[PDB]
Amino acid sequence: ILKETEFKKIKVLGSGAFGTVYKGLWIPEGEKVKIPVAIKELREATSPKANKEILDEAYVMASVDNPHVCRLLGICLTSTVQLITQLMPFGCLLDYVREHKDNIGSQYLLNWCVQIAKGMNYLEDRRLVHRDLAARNVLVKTPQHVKITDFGLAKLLVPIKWMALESILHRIYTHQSDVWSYGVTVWELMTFGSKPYDGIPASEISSILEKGERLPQPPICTIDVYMIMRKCWMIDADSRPKFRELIIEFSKMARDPQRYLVIQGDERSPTDSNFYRAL
Ligand SMILES: *CCC(=O)N1CC[C@H](n2cc(-c3ccncc3)c(-c3cccc(OCc4ccc5c(c4)CN(C)C5=O)c3)n2)C1
CATH class of the missing domain: 1.10.510.10 (Transferase(Phosphotransferase) domain 1)
Incomplete structure (x- = not known):
């Protein structure tokens, strides 16, 4: 649960059945830096009970990390909830x-x-x-x-x-x-x-x-x-x-x-592969 004042929505990335996803910026309190994050703002208002349910369920799933499952990093309890996760630049x-x-x-x-x-x-x-x-x-x-x-x-x-x-x-x-x-x-x-x-x-x-x-x-x-x-x-x-x-x-x-797969021209970057790992 983070202060709404610390997150700024800057660009729409897409939307789903529950909300709109934005590329956002996190400005920690006292700081001037802008750290890119992904924010999903839910379309419908939600009860504090339902917010507690989201947080509890996220806390159990994120008790241990898994490299192939996104964890909920934070939440902003505004008019409608804003879920915060790591930004995936490549999208879906x-x-x-x-x-x-x-x-x-x-x-x-x-x-x-x-x-x-x-x-x-x-x-x-x-x-x-x-x-x-x-x-x-x-x-x-x-x-x-x-x-x-x-x-x-x-x-x-x-x-x-x-x-x-x-x-x-x-x-x-x-x-x-x-x-x-x-x-x-x-x-x-x-x-x-x-x-x-x-x-x-x-x-x-x-x-x-x-x-x-x-x-x-x-x-x-x-x-x-x-x-x-x-x-x-x-x-x-x-x-x-x-x-x-x-x-x-x-x-x-x-x-x-x-x-197992037959794709046209399948037989036809090493440096980019190496850099992705290092970054
Ligand atoms: C390509 C399809 C598309 O546009 N989408 C929009 C909806 C969905 N999507 C994409 C993203 C996203 C995009 C870029 N970088 C990161 C994420 C998200 C998104 C954005 C912010 C927050 C989100 O939270 C998901 C989440 C994760 C874990 C848990 C929960 C919710 C609730 N809970 C109990 C958890 O444990 C998702 N959404 C594709």
């Missing part, structure tokens, strides 16, 4: 894959799959369920390092095309329904940011899933990769993969990436 992975649609290699796509599975497995080990995993909620720290944002905002504050059937029908959320959203997240990556079930209304999604219909195989995917996605969308939650199995599977694929 959904926008990143759309921008680099002609320059993304199989090695990067497969590593991002491992990283998201590692961040999701960390939440599962802590018995925490995200409820809103999507490529828009995976942020890019560097092209080699992605992190999941917005943990717990869904439960505390509806993305039908990312939800497991049991979640659509009964608002049931488990680690296995997060696995279903992981499959959809992978499908967005593998199609370079396509919209799932494009042209199908959200009201028809449950029935479409009930008939056996699923997202199609992205052109770059071998059957081995698509089969893992399909298993994430099994009606029976217990038949879907576990995040630790997904980690193993995608990590195996990442060690020989051209055997």
Whole structure:
């Protein structure tokens, strides 16, 4: 809980179902420096009880660090709450894959799959369920390092095309329904940011899933990769993969990436890679 007077919103970065994200500046009290931060200002007013719930839930998730999960760094208790996290200059992975649609290699796509599975497995080990995993909620720290944002905002504050059937029908959320959203997240990556079930209304999604219909195989995917996605969308939650199995599977694929993804010109920066690490 920090003083609102210390944070200044300077530029809009985007928005989600709960708020507007800004690139902000932190000016510590007594100081003249401006430290860049990311601020999400919630659209709806919230009760002090709901603010305490956000802080408590963030305190438990952030008790231990995980390199692939964003932690809530601070909060400003204004008219509407302002959540503060580390600024990710590269924005979200959904926008990143759309921008680099002609320059993304199989090695990067497969590593991002491992990283998201590692961040999701960390939440599962802590018995925490995200409820809103999507490529828009995976942020890019560097092209080699992605992190999941917005943990717990869904439960505390509806993305039908990312939800497991049991979640659509009964608002049931488990680690296995997060696995279903992981499959959809992978499908967005593998199609370079396509919209799932494009042209199908959200009201028809449950029935479409009930008939056996699923997202199609992205052109770059071998059957081995698509089969893992399909298993994430099994009606029976217990038949879907576990995040630790997904980690193993995608990590195996990442060690020989051209055997699992076929991308045009895949075979074609070392200094930038080194500098990203050093910085
Ligand atoms: C590309 C899609 C897009 O535009 N988005 C807007 C919504 C979502 N997003 C992006 C960012 C962001 C952008 C740049 N740098 C950093 C972050 C955020 C964001 C911004 C500020 C604060 C945020 O807090 C998320 C958070 C993290 C942990 C926890 C909670 C909330 C609540 N809780 C209990 C936690 O443990 C997120 N949002 C993509």
